[PDB]
Symmetry: C3
Subunit: 96 residues, 3 copies
């Protein structure tokens, strides 16, 4: 259980997002943030919780989607997730 | 220390909050996000509550109890490790930093 | 790699930022959040707060924390919190750099 967090350029969202649904990723959460700096630029923060096996793959897509041509495209941080539970049912881990 | 991140339906916020206060949770942090889970993005709330390991499950059980509706889209909860938690005002650490009597 | 997350008072941003610029921090990401604690202000529900996310090497963690605390503290209720969480990987989109290469200049 890993959390991939990709801060990217706003307009790239759609492009990236579509790729992710084609990767078999069920869900993600997008927030709007400001980034610094090269003073603060409008950027999107993508949070996707996936299985350990898919991390690199997902990453490889995100970067592929988020690349442009100039400095400031974004960053990607992978963090551990200890537990994931679904609210409607109460399922845990892989079921969620 | 553990970090509970609950993506829930917006209107449920208040209810959840009450549960947490009745759970003895003093504080939390809420941000606005858009989510999709089975264009397709829905307005949802993100609650961030840092608790003690021992308190994790109970808190979860409360959150789920409050944020549940029974319909698809209720949201999810992720527990992640936090290596340090410090209160800025005092300099307190761990349980002291997120509890106040 | 470690992720320092500092939820602070809005107006303190600049100030903390200055510390970080003096700390040798190249970049950071700030989001706007609502918070709940002891401080309030019907009566104020959730209060406007800033969320800072900085990914650094473990060695730089304490120093940065000590800087942030030095800058964002007031002595009154509502100053905020700081949580450090582990980060297993950090990647730059442009090149594909990993770890220390992706967040340092
Ligand atoms: N893999 C994921 N990573 C992060 N957030 C997710 C993920 N999957 C779903 N979510 C969040 O959950 C919400 C929808 O939950 P959903 O999957 O519909 O729950 P359920 O299956 O119980 O209906 C979305 O708005 C999204 O914010
Ligand atoms: N320490 C950090 N933690 C999280 N995000 C960062 C950090 N440093 C830079 N970033 C992200 O990188 C984006 C822009 O990169 P910047 O640091 O301005 O120069 P460069 O594009 O050369 O990396 C910013 O939006 C910011 O959110
Ligand atoms: N468990 C928690 N998780 C996340 N953020 C918290 C938590 N407890 C408090 N906070 C943050 O602290 C702010 C106010 O809390 P408060 O009790 O005034 O802290 P302090 O006692 O350090 O002044 C809120 O805006 C909230 O974002």
């Amino acid at each position: 259980m890993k959390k991939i967090e990709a801060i990217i350029r706003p307009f790239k969202l759609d492009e990236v997002k579509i790729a992710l649904v084609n990767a078999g990723i069920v869900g993600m959460t997008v927030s709007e943030v400001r980034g610094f700096g090269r003073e603060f630029l409008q950027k999107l923060k993508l949070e996707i919780v996936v299985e350990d096996a898919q991390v690199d793959t997902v990453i490889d897509k995100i970067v592929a989607a988020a690349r442009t041509g100039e400095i400031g495209d974004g960053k990607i941080f992978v963090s551990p997730v200890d537990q994931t539970i679904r609210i409607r049912t109460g399922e845990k881990n892989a079921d969620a």
